[PDB]
Amino acid sequence: LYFQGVTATSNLFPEKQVTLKTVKVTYMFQSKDKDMLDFQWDMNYDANVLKPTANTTRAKSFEYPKIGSYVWNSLPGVIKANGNTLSLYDTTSKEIVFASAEFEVIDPEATATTVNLDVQVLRLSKVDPATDMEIGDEEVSVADKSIVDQEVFDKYVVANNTVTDP
Numbered sequence: 001l002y003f004q005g006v007t008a009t010s011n012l013f014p015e016k017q018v019t020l021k022t023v024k025v026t027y028m029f030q031s032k033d034k035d036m037l038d039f040q041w042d043m044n045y046d047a048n049v050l051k052p053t054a055n056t057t058r059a060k061s062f063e064y065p066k067i068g069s070y071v072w073n074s075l076p077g078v079i080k081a082n083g084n085t086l087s088l089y090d091t092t093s094k095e096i097v098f099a100s101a102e103f104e105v106i107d108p109e110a111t112a113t114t115v116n117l118d119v120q121v122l123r124l125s126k127v128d129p130a131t132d133m134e135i136g137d138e139e140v141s142v143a144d145k146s147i148v149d150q151e152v153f154d155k156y157v158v159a160n161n162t163v164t165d166p
Contacts, residue, residue, distance in 0.1 A: 006050075006103075008162055010117035011148055016162045020111045022053060022104055023164065027117055029098035030159035031142075034124035035088035037134050040081070041099050042118040047077035049113040050103035063096035064089050086133045088125060095159045119143045124156055 005019040013027045025043075029036075058065050058072040061081055065072065068085025079101055083089060090096070099117050122142040125134035140152050 005111045006164075007114045008117075008164055009114060010119060010162065011146055012098075012119040012122065012143060013117060013160050013162045016164045018164045018166055020105055020166075021108075022102055023050075023115075023166070024055075024100070024102040025115050025117075026100040026163045026165075027098045028095045028159060028161040028163055029091055029157070030095040031091040031124055031156050032158045033092065034126050034138065034140060034156055036083075036091040036122070037086070037088055037125040037139060038082075038084040038121055038123040039089075039098070039119070040121040042120065043079040043081075043099055043101055044114075044116045044118060045077060045079075045101075045103060046113045049106060049110055050115065051106050052079070053102040053104050055102040060100060060102075061097075062099065082121070086127075088127055088134055091124070095161070118146055119148070120146050124152075 003017060006023050008016040008025045010027060052074055061072050068083055070083045073080045121144055124140050126138045127133060128135055140156060141149055142152050142157060
């Protein structure tokens with residue numbers, strides 16, 4: 001056997017393995033009927049192997065960084081992000097950038113490492129047209145405590161793709 005390089009994994013997205021200068025990892029999400037109320041993810045990496053590039057920014061981390069209360073913080077070895085708005089993020093009309101980051105291989109001789117997107121919270125809901133505010137009754141958890149609800153997933157999630165470059 002011969003596979004050595006970056007392993008892109010997640011609790012909510014299928015794993016991808018890429019052989020390597022730079023690697024971009026983008027997790028693409030789409031729901032049916034119910035738009036996104038609240039999300040929290042940590043993209044964990046090895047700070048000794050991979051370093052976030054100049055392209056790893058708040059702006060390029062998520063589809064809707066200016067909408068609702070979006071927190072983005074790049075710390076050593078972890079990119080922490082969470083978003084929320086009672087008006088909801090549009091995850092129904094098209095497939096969105098849920099999480100994205102671009103990493104630089106610090107030492108070209110050291111390629112073998114894991115980038116892992118821990119999706120801690122993903123809640124969907126539907127707005128009352130009269131208010132444009134989410135209906136508390138219609139809230140469903142796709143993910144909570146980093147545990148994906150298979151029944152809710154099968155019902156509401158229509159796209160969950162891991163896209164790498166290369």
